[PDB]
Ligand SMILES: NC(=O)c1ccc[n+]([C@@H]2O[C@H](COP(=O)([O-])OP(=O)(O)OC[C@H]3O[C@@H](n4cnc5c(N)ncnc54)[C@H](OP(=O)(O)O)[C@@H]3O)[C@@H](O)[C@H]2O)c1
Ligand SMILES: NC(=O)c1ccc[n+]([C@@H]2O[C@H](COP(=O)([O-])OP(=O)(O)OC[C@H]3O[C@@H](n4cnc5c(N)ncnc54)[C@H](OP(=O)(O)O)[C@@H]3O)[C@@H](O)[C@H]2O)c1
């Protein structure tokens with residue numbers, strides 16, 4: 001089973017400020033919706049609680065507590081290793097969709113990254129990890145919008 | 158100016174049947190939406206007449222006749238060459254978006270290809286061109302839907 005990572009980050013590395021994403025770039029959301037359509041997503045419990053089970057996707061959520069979802073479209077796992085083994089029975093592909101913590105824990109597992117860089121330098125306390133040079137860009141496209149953004153796809157080795 | 162080309166084709170290469178696209182693969186048009194957002198498209202007259210001028214895009218349309226368009230986001234050119242020369246004064250990137258005729262005439266000038274292959278083999282009368290082997294796949298993702306589809310990004314070597 002292949003692991004992809006999909007994230008949006010500001011030019012200063014910020015991805016979150018408290019429970020919010022500190023920007024609104026018109027259009028960027030389309031990339032995320034289009035590439036995750038009917039895909040399995042892996043997300044942290046805090047991020048899942050912020051966005052909820054939006055339609056046409058399937059969710060694997062990790063928690064260290066007894067937290068549960070209430071939605072037959074979500075599977076809660078006690079660990080990332082357990083989520084990976086569980087998903088592997090059900091799918092060939094999972095897309096890691098965030099939490100700052102989830103990103104840092106799963107970047108080493110990812111063979112493909114989908115990275116939107118937003119032309120803004122906001123304040124926030126949550127940051128995307130440095131992209132290791134075990135990955136390289138194979139595709140890139142710029143978008144002009146109310147806030148501009150650049151979309152890149154990175155592949156491993 | 159960069160030239161990309163974006164197309165959805167069935168597994169038998171059909172892209173059209175009269176003025177229609179002969180399938181409904183739920184989800185696939187999101188890829189088209191996301192990648193064309195605030196982009197310039199090059200379309201043929203026949204294709205443009207079918208879809209119409211959806212928002213957040215600019216259109217270059219080519220025709221050999223007296224056909225014109227009201228919409229203020231559309232520029233009509235008499236030839237592919239004039240459209241390319243004209244677009245280059247206006248944009249850094251254009252996305253050829255079809256017509257079988259337009260695809261054949263412009264594939265040689267594209268640096269990047271976005272191809273969705275739809276899991277169907279319908280009857281039709283318009284076909285996508287042979288992809289030269291100067292292009293290679295650098296990304297691929299499978300989608301399950303009512304009709305499955307596979308998204309591939311090709312780059313020219
Ligand atoms: N691309 C983006 O710009 C993007 C995307 C999504 C989110 N965000 C932002 O990121 C911020 C939230 O990130 P965050 O790091 O605070 O939270 P998070 O990663 O969404 O969730 C962290 C939680 O997930 C659970 N968890 C993490 N690793 C686990 C493991 N190995 N095993 C079991 N459970 C595990 C824990 O749940 P418990 O607390 O239940 O134990 C932990 O508290 C928000 O600001 C949000 O807006 C940005
Ligand atoms: N990716 C996809 O699956 C996709 C995308 C788009 C369209 N389609 C399908 O493709 C079919 C349409 O393709 P098509 O080949 O019949 O038509 P088309 O390529 O969309 O348009 C052909 C017309 O474009 C103009 N044209 C072409 N080359 C020109 C040139 N060198 N100089 C000036 N004008 C030029 C001419 O317009 P005039 O007749 O006005 O002179 C010509 O009749 C439809 O069925 C549509 O559903 C599929």
Ligand SMILES: CCc1nc(N)nc(N)c1C#C[C@H](C)c1cc2c(c(-c3ccc(CN)cc3)c1)OCO2
Pocket residue numbers: 006007008028029030031032047050051054096097098114115116
């Ligand atoms: C485009 C973002 C985006 N772009 C890219 N490149 N990669 C990504 N990983 C994400 C993302 C994301 C998160 C999971 C997300 C995705 C969403 C969300 C919301 C949302 C969260 C909280 C609230 C509460 N106020 C409302 C909505 C959150 O709503 C539509 O989809």
Ligand SMILES: CCc1nc(N)nc(N)c1C#C[C@H](C)c1cc2c(c(-c3ccc(CN)cc3)c1)OCO2
Pocket residue numbers: 163164165176177178185186188189204207208211254255271272273
């Ligand atoms: C999107 C498919 C698609 N996917 C990919 N990868 N590449 C493409 N080049 C196209 C295409 C196309 C054509 C030009 C097209 C042809 C049409 C269309 C529409 C259309 C109709 C309704 C809506 C809803 N807003 C959006 C688009 C789009 O209406 C009938 O004729």
